[PDB]
Amino acid sequence: ANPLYQKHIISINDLSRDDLNLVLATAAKLKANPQPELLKHKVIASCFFEASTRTRLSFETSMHRLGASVVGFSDSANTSLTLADTISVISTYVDAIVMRHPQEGAARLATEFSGNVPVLNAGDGSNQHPTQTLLDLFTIQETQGRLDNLHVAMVGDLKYGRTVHSLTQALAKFDGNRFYFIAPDALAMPQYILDMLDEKGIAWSLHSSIEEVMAEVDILYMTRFVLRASDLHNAKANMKVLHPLPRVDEIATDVDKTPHAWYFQQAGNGIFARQALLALVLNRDLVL
Amino acid sequence: ANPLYQKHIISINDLSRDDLNLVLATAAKLKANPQPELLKHKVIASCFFEASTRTRLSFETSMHRLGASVVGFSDSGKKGETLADTISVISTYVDAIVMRHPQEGAARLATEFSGNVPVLNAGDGSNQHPTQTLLDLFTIQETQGRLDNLHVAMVGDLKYGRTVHSLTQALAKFDGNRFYFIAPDALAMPQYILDMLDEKGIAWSLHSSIEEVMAEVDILYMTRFVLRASDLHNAKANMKVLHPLPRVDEIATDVDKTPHAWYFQQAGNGIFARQALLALVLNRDLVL
Amino acid sequence: ANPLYQKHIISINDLSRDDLNLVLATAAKLKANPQPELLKHKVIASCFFEASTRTRLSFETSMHRLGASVVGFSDSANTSLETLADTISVISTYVDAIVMRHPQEGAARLATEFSGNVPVLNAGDGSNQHPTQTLLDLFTIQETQGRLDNLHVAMVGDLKYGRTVHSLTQALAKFDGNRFYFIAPDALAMPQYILDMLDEKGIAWSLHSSIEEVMAEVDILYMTRVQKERLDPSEYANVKAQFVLRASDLHNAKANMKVLHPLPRVDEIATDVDKTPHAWYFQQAGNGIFARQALLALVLNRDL
Ligand SMILES: [Ca+2]
Ligand SMILES: [Ca+2]
């Protein structure tokens, strides 16, 4: 019944504003009221071809919080592993496949072999990572009370930073958002993103420092240009500092103590996002 | 209690028809009518000393489909001395041990130290592999409606291929079967096998191509002679192509599309053959 | 009372006699009547940053025995792991409890600083603390000896690097009038600090050259493996077990005597002992399930 029922979740680009809204709403609903037996008789494959601990643990916890069983591998390194044949087989054992693969396009390729077994992409090479964007959006909505009319600053390697690409694209599905791109000249936000914004009549601008935008942003999204506690003197009371993680020198730990730090809470939201995705995909009926 | 109750399952040869048939009927029961809570209070150890991804995923899923909890390792029992001790310890924890060990003899040894805890061999070296044979037989039974009076063709490396040996051996336990061996001269089916067929009056014959017998075959069991869709033009409506997997080049993808292609379905049957053993070993009587 | 509710379990030093008792009593309870759903609906993280198969399987079985769900890693090499601090900061937002084993000493402690309201249970911290081992050892002694006071306990083997005996000894000393016998290589002797601790408490101890010399007097024979991987190069000679227990040594053993070994064992315990009534190292390992269950239950369940 639900629009996401039995669908593959490969790219954030396949999710419409409505779809995003749907997942986000579900997520909050589940966060409000758990459904420990929602996926009681399901077995889900957690196929981590390339290890990604946080994501895997997040995803598996979500499974368990819905009542599902889990089988899988956390890395291929030590396994006995065509990807195609691998998928055709696993597809005969499980109700859904969550897969993270080292090669971009893998997830998409898997959908051609899973039969009608949904494939949820948990990281495709660098490329696409739908649940990361979802939990990012969820966090913004939650903290911000909305996904429209926000001032959003993205700091770091914007050239290669794909979570930033995906999140920009997703936020751009909403209305009245204003972007600030803070990157070194050599690692700038790609034209293609800029063009897309222009296509939607979305305002964006470039900056050489966070200082420049601090006072105006609601969301400060960091990527590996360094953020220290003192940098927030003039932050907005509602401003939140996000980071898909992990971090490094990029965000000083003295930031962790500030009310702006929200990267761990952000991470904690992957549970609700993942749970929402799983529930909609595997369940016909809605999350009353 | 069923005849397999609390029994070790090391080699299919330990099994008798009353057993295979039991296992087979049970696997069919579960296939139709799942018992999600059959092994609810059991904890099973999944001990893959050497990675066997498909088998382990298959087995754990089986465990879950029955409601058992799972503990274990995917890859690693190098020495008989420490191995015995490992088994000794583990067996104070779980209800059953599912093990795959690369050193032939290892599974039998474990039984010496497991106390009252049943040991199920998931792959002993590159030799004993009871569950593989059971899943093959079940697949044949399931698709052919019987195990007797069948025309079976075995193709590939019939020399160093233990699965074929066992399958042939098992199949020989039934009546009216006729075999076709298609192997390169250097990889021919072993004389001893031939002799046992002889002992029972079972008719067999060697062929240079699949094409020559295609019209007679009920079961086409492939190992590794490239099988292609074109080869099947004259196949019997009921004919199924089987392959224990993995496959490399021996079966062309175009076959995959054909109705005869059953290696994926065969792999899926692994879930039911394995559930059936787990169930028979750990549950007194699963009323059918 | 459950003074253990939501408490971090980092060290045995942190646990009082009442605490120990509470833990052992619960274990006995659980053993008698398991509570297969006591922890249904909890998700526990099994983080073996340092692989430890037997200990890991024990802990996890315990979890399942209570109906909890488990997530985790068997070793850090098969992971993508970023600070431990950030790691715990993240995981603690998903799970109800974190069971951790780590190569560095004080790692578990540090985890407590970042876990928020999530209890951290130490399954091995460098060459430091290993609380549940000590718990299962105590439970084993108490079950077979019917008590934890006024016992004659021998500890044999690598006493220099044997943290489990250092720990077991501290715990035992929390009980009344235990008597210890230390049988170790000249070079892998029990540390001064433990000795000074015993003196302090007026607890008697003595050094021995053999197991035979104490066989007749002991209730518990606690065997250890040489900590090969911790041995200094001026200690390389001490690699081979200096003391081997063989079945023939049991001839004058007290009837109630039990041979324990935290495992795994190298040469120190010959196989012929395994079939004697004195061999109790496998039973001991089995009791790891009850003790681990007990600790989880207390930490995660308000009421006993
Ligand atoms: Ca709006
Ligand atoms: Ca705290």
Coordinates of N, CA and C in Angstrom, one line a residue, chain C residues 155-273:
Chain C
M155 N 47.7 -21.3 43.6 CA 47.8 -20.7 42.3 C 49.1 -21.0 41.7
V156 N 49.1 -21.6 40.5 CA 50.3 -22.1 39.9 C 50.5 -21.6 38.5
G157 N 51.8 -21.4 38.2 CA 52.2 -21.0 36.8 C 52.7 -19.6 36.7
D158 N 52.3 -18.9 35.6 CA 52.8 -17.6 35.4 C 52.0 -16.6 36.3
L159 N 52.6 -16.3 37.4 CA 52.0 -15.4 38.4 C 52.4 -14.0 38.2
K160 N 53.3 -13.8 37.3 CA 53.8 -12.5 37.1 C 52.8 -11.8 36.2
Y161 N 52.5 -12.4 35.1 CA 51.6 -11.8 34.1 C 50.1 -12.4 34.2
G162 N 49.9 -13.3 35.1 CA 48.6 -13.8 35.3 C 47.7 -12.9 36.1
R163 N 47.0 -12.0 35.3 CA 46.1 -11.0 35.9 C 44.9 -11.6 36.5
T164 N 44.4 -12.8 36.0 CA 43.3 -13.5 36.5 C 43.6 -14.0 38.0
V165 N 44.8 -14.3 38.3 CA 45.1 -14.8 39.6 C 45.3 -13.6 40.5
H166 N 45.8 -12.5 39.9 CA 45.9 -11.3 40.7 C 44.6 -10.8 41.2
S167 N 43.6 -10.9 40.3 CA 42.3 -10.5 40.4 C 41.5 -11.4 41.4
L168 N 41.7 -12.7 41.1 CA 41.0 -13.8 41.9 C 41.5 -13.6 43.4
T169 N 42.8 -13.4 43.5 CA 43.4 -13.2 44.8 C 42.8 -12.0 45.6
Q170 N 42.6 -10.9 44.9 CA 42.0 -9.7 45.5 C 40.6 -10.0 46.0
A171 N 39.8 -10.7 45.1 CA 38.5 -10.9 45.4 C 38.4 -11.9 46.6
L172 N 39.1 -13.0 46.6 CA 39.2 -13.9 47.7 C 39.5 -13.3 49.0
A173 N 40.4 -12.3 49.0 CA 40.9 -11.6 50.1 C 39.8 -10.8 50.7
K174 N 38.7 -10.7 50.0 CA 37.5 -9.9 50.5 C 36.7 -10.7 51.4
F175 N 37.0 -12.0 51.4 CA 36.5 -13.1 52.2 C 37.4 -13.3 53.4
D176 N 36.8 -14.1 54.4 CA 37.6 -14.4 55.6 C 38.4 -15.7 55.6
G177 N 39.7 -15.5 56.1 CA 40.7 -16.4 56.4 C 41.1 -17.4 55.3
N178 N 41.2 -16.9 54.1 CA 41.6 -17.8 53.0 C 43.2 -18.0 53.1
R179 N 43.7 -19.1 52.6 CA 45.1 -19.3 52.7 C 45.6 -19.6 51.3
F180 N 46.7 -18.9 50.9 CA 47.2 -19.0 49.6 C 48.6 -19.7 49.5
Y181 N 48.7 -20.4 48.4 CA 50.0 -21.0 48.1 C 50.5 -20.6 46.7
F182 N 51.6 -19.9 46.6 CA 52.0 -19.5 45.3 C 53.2 -20.4 44.7
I183 N 52.9 -21.0 43.6 CA 53.8 -21.9 42.9 C 54.2 -21.4 41.5
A184 N 55.2 -20.6 41.5 CA 55.6 -20.0 40.2 C 57.1 -20.0 40.0
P185 N 57.4 -19.8 38.7 CA 58.8 -19.7 38.4 C 59.5 -18.6 39.1
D186 N 60.7 -18.7 39.3 CA 61.4 -17.6 40.0 C 61.1 -16.3 39.4
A187 N 61.1 -16.3 38.0 CA 60.9 -15.1 37.2 C 59.5 -14.7 37.0
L188 N 58.5 -15.6 37.2 CA 57.1 -15.2 37.0 C 56.3 -15.3 38.2
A189 N 57.0 -14.7 39.2 CA 56.4 -14.6 40.6 C 55.2 -13.7 40.7
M190 N 54.4 -14.0 41.8 CA 53.3 -13.1 42.2 C 54.0 -11.8 42.5
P191 N 53.3 -10.7 42.2 CA 53.8 -9.4 42.4 C 53.7 -8.9 43.9
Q192 N 54.7 -8.1 44.2 CA 54.8 -7.5 45.6 C 53.5 -6.9 46.1
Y193 N 53.0 -6.1 45.2 CA 51.7 -5.4 45.6 C 50.6 -6.3 46.0
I194 N 50.6 -7.5 45.4 CA 49.5 -8.4 45.9 C 49.9 -9.0 47.3
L195 N 51.2 -9.3 47.4 CA 51.8 -9.8 48.6 C 51.6 -8.8 49.7
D196 N 52.0 -7.6 49.5 CA 51.8 -6.6 50.5 C 50.4 -6.4 50.9
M197 N 49.5 -6.6 50.0 CA 48.0 -6.5 50.2 C 47.6 -7.5 51.1
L198 N 48.1 -8.8 51.0 CA 47.7 -9.9 51.8 C 48.3 -9.6 53.2
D199 N 49.5 -9.2 53.3 CA 50.1 -9.0 54.6 C 49.2 -8.0 55.4
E200 N 48.9 -6.9 54.7 CA 48.1 -5.9 55.1 C 46.8 -6.4 55.8
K201 N 46.2 -7.4 55.2 CA 45.0 -7.9 55.6 C 45.2 -9.1 56.6
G202 N 46.5 -9.4 56.9 CA 46.8 -10.5 57.7 C 46.3 -11.8 57.2
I203 N 46.4 -11.9 55.8 CA 46.0 -13.1 55.1 C 47.3 -13.9 54.8
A204 N 47.3 -15.2 55.3 CA 48.5 -16.0 55.1 C 48.8 -16.5 53.7
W205 N 50.1 -16.4 53.3 CA 50.5 -16.9 52.0 C 51.9 -17.5 52.0
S206 N 52.2 -18.4 51.1 CA 53.5 -19.0 51.0 C 53.8 -19.5 49.6
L207 N 55.1 -19.5 49.4 CA 55.7 -19.8 48.1 C 56.2 -21.3 48.1
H208 N 55.9 -22.0 47.0 CA 56.2 -23.4 46.9 C 57.0 -23.8 45.7
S209 N 57.7 -24.9 45.7 CA 58.5 -25.3 44.5 C 57.9 -26.4 43.7
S210 N 56.7 -26.8 44.1 CA 56.1 -27.9 43.4 C 54.6 -27.9 43.8
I211 N 53.8 -28.6 43.0 CA 52.4 -28.8 43.3 C 52.3 -29.9 44.4
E212 N 53.2 -30.9 44.3 CA 53.1 -32.1 45.2 C 53.1 -31.6 46.6
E213 N 54.0 -30.7 46.9 CA 54.2 -30.3 48.3 C 52.9 -29.7 48.9
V214 N 52.0 -29.3 48.0 CA 50.7 -28.7 48.6 C 49.5 -29.5 48.3
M215 N 49.6 -30.5 47.4 CA 48.5 -31.3 47.0 C 47.6 -31.8 48.2
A216 N 48.2 -32.2 49.3 CA 47.4 -32.7 50.3 C 46.6 -31.6 51.1
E217 N 47.0 -30.4 51.0 CA 46.3 -29.3 51.8 C 45.3 -28.4 51.1
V218 N 45.2 -28.5 49.7 CA 44.4 -27.6 49.0 C 43.0 -28.0 48.6
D219 N 42.2 -27.0 48.5 CA 40.7 -27.1 48.1 C 40.6 -26.8 46.6
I220 N 41.4 -25.9 46.2 CA 41.4 -25.3 44.8 C 42.8 -25.2 44.3
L221 N 43.0 -25.9 43.1 CA 44.3 -25.8 42.4 C 44.0 -25.0 41.2
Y222 N 44.5 -23.8 41.2 CA 44.2 -22.9 40.1 C 45.5 -22.7 39.2
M223 N 45.4 -23.4 38.1 CA 46.4 -23.5 37.1 C 46.3 -22.3 36.0
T224 N 47.5 -21.9 35.6 CA 47.6 -20.8 34.6 C 48.6 -21.1 33.5
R225 N 48.4 -20.4 32.4 CA 49.2 -20.6 31.2 C 50.3 -19.5 31.2
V226 N 51.5 -19.8 30.7 CA 52.5 -18.7 30.6 C 52.0 -17.7 29.6
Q227 N 52.1 -16.4 30.0 CA 51.7 -15.3 29.1 C 52.8 -15.0 28.1
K228 N 52.9 -16.0 27.2 CA 54.0 -15.9 26.2 C 54.2 -14.6 25.6
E229 N 53.1 -14.0 25.1 CA 53.0 -12.8 24.4 C 53.3 -11.6 25.2
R230 N 53.5 -11.7 26.6 CA 53.9 -10.6 27.4 C 55.3 -10.7 28.0
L231 N 55.8 -11.9 28.0 CA 57.1 -12.2 28.4 C 58.2 -11.3 27.9
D232 N 59.1 -10.8 28.8 CA 60.3 -10.1 28.3 C 61.3 -11.0 27.7
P233 N 62.2 -10.5 26.9 CA 63.2 -11.3 26.2 C 64.3 -11.9 27.2
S234 N 64.2 -11.4 28.4 CA 65.1 -11.9 29.5 C 64.3 -12.9 30.3
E235 N 63.1 -13.3 29.7 CA 62.2 -14.2 30.3 C 61.8 -15.4 29.4
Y236 N 62.4 -15.3 28.2 CA 62.1 -16.2 27.1 C 62.3 -17.7 27.6
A237 N 63.2 -17.9 28.6 CA 63.4 -19.2 29.1 C 62.2 -19.7 29.9
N238 N 61.4 -18.8 30.3 CA 60.2 -19.2 31.1 C 59.0 -19.6 30.3
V239 N 59.2 -19.7 29.0 CA 58.1 -20.0 28.1 C 57.4 -21.3 28.4
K240 N 58.2 -22.4 28.5 CA 57.7 -23.7 28.8 C 57.0 -23.7 30.2
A241 N 55.9 -24.3 30.3 CA 55.3 -24.4 31.7 C 56.3 -25.1 32.6
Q242 N 56.5 -24.5 33.7 CA 57.5 -25.1 34.7 C 56.8 -26.1 35.5
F243 N 55.5 -26.0 35.7 CA 54.8 -27.0 36.4 C 53.7 -27.6 35.6
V244 N 53.7 -28.9 35.5 CA 52.7 -29.7 34.8 C 52.0 -30.6 35.8
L245 N 50.6 -30.5 35.8 CA 49.8 -31.3 36.6 C 49.4 -32.6 35.9
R246 N 49.7 -33.7 36.5 CA 49.3 -35.0 35.8 C 48.4 -35.8 36.7
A247 N 47.6 -36.7 36.2 CA 46.7 -37.4 37.0 C 47.3 -38.0 38.2
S248 N 48.6 -38.5 38.0 CA 49.2 -39.2 39.1 C 49.4 -38.3 40.3
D249 N 49.5 -37.0 40.1 CA 49.6 -36.1 41.2 C 48.4 -36.0 42.1
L250 N 47.3 -36.6 41.6 CA 46.0 -36.5 42.4 C 45.8 -37.5 43.4
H251 N 46.7 -38.5 43.5 CA 46.6 -39.6 44.5 C 46.3 -39.1 45.9
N252 N 46.9 -38.1 46.4 CA 46.6 -37.6 47.7 C 45.8 -36.4 47.7
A253 N 45.1 -36.1 46.7 CA 44.3 -34.9 46.6 C 43.1 -34.9 47.6
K254 N 42.7 -33.8 48.3 CA 41.5 -33.9 49.1 C 40.3 -34.3 48.2
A255 N 39.4 -34.9 48.7 CA 38.2 -35.4 48.0 C 37.5 -34.2 47.3
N256 N 37.4 -33.0 48.0 CA 36.7 -31.9 47.5 C 37.5 -31.0 46.6
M257 N 38.8 -31.3 46.4 CA 39.6 -30.5 45.6 C 39.2 -30.5 44.1
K258 N 39.2 -29.3 43.5 CA 39.0 -29.0 42.1 C 40.1 -28.3 41.5
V259 N 40.5 -28.7 40.3 CA 41.5 -28.1 39.5 C 40.8 -27.1 38.6
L260 N 41.2 -25.8 38.6 CA 40.6 -24.8 37.8 C 41.7 -24.3 36.9
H261 N 41.2 -23.7 35.7 CA 42.1 -23.1 34.7 C 41.2 -22.1 33.9
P262 N 41.5 -20.8 33.9 CA 40.7 -19.8 33.2 C 40.6 -20.1 31.7
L263 N 41.6 -20.9 31.2 CA 41.7 -21.4 29.8 C 42.1 -20.2 28.9
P264 N 42.8 -20.5 27.8 CA 43.1 -21.8 27.4 C 44.4 -22.3 28.0
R265 N 44.6 -23.6 28.1 CA 45.7 -24.2 28.7 C 46.7 -24.7 27.7
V266 N 48.0 -24.6 28.0 CA 49.0 -25.1 27.1 C 49.3 -26.5 27.6
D267 N 50.5 -26.6 28.2 CA 51.0 -27.9 28.7 C 50.8 -28.2 30.1
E268 N 50.6 -27.1 30.9 CA 50.5 -27.2 32.4 C 49.5 -28.2 33.0
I269 N 48.5 -28.6 32.2 CA 47.5 -29.6 32.5 C 47.5 -30.7 31.5
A270 N 48.1 -31.8 31.9 CA 48.1 -33.0 31.0 C 46.6 -33.5 30.8
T271 N 46.4 -34.1 29.6 CA 45.1 -34.6 29.3 C 44.6 -35.7 30.2
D272 N 45.5 -36.4 30.8 CA 45.0 -37.5 31.7 C 44.2 -37.0 32.9
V273 N 44.4 -35.7 33.2 CA 43.6 -35.2 34.4 C 42.2 -35.0 34.0

